[PDB]
């Protein structure tokens, strides 16, 4: 039969700047969301490109379960997602980058923020979407702080032979 045997499809994917960017006196920020694609006779449709990039946004922009404190939290904002009690992979969804607290000089706080970012995006390797991830964070002044996230993808069809590691599963998104 035709070599195009992989029948797996791809669903919607959140995209950066889907709903434009919101500007302010401090700077310009993207406003991610779903994307609508239009045909020549109406018949709008959702976009599904950049699967891994869309998945990464979901991990970062969602609060995870907050650690117990001994004083407690209101039931509304304990964090997390009620759907995580059904999954079997033994992990919890969301991130915790927003739960940092000002400790010591600003240099220490930034270093801790980087630690959480790696500890959250590390889940990407566990699912098998990407084979490696690393974040580089630079502190060059009081206000200007930059962070860059690098995600390593793979091609759909194996080409190389004799890999030290393993071919990541769920690689049909080729990213």
């Amino acid at each position: 039969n035709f070599e195009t045997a992989d029948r797996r499809k791809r669903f919607w994917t959140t995209q950066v700047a889907a709903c434009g960017q919101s500007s302010d006196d401090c700077g310009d920020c993207a406003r991610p969301g779903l994307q609508l694609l239009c045909n020549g006779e109406g018949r709008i449709t959702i976009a599904t490109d950049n699967y891994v990039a869309g998945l990464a946004l979901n991990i970062l922009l969602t609060d995870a379960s907050k650690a117990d404190t001994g004083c407690g939290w209101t039931p509304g904002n304990r964090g997390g997602f009620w759907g995580d009690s059904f999954r079997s992979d033994n992990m919890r969804s969301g991130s915790k980058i927003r739960q940092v607290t000002a400790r010591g000089s600003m240099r220490e706080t930034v270093a801790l923020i980087r630690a959480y970012a790696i500890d959250d995006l590390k889940k990407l390797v566990a699912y098998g979407v990407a084979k490696s991830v690393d974040v580089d964070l630079t502190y060059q002044g009081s206000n200007k702080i930059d962070m860059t996230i690098m995600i390593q993808g793979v091609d759909g069809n194996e080409s190389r032979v004799g890999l030290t590691g393993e071919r990541i599963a769920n690689a049909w998104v080729w990213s």
Partner: peptide, 22 residues
């Protein structure tokens, strides 16, 4: 029926669609 046998990767959009449906 929808994804043609593809696995449901947690934290993707289809993950939230499935849980809302349930």
């Amino acid at each position: 029926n929808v994804l043609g046998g593809a696995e449901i990767i947690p934290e993707s959009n289809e993950f939230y669609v499935v849980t809302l449906e349930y």
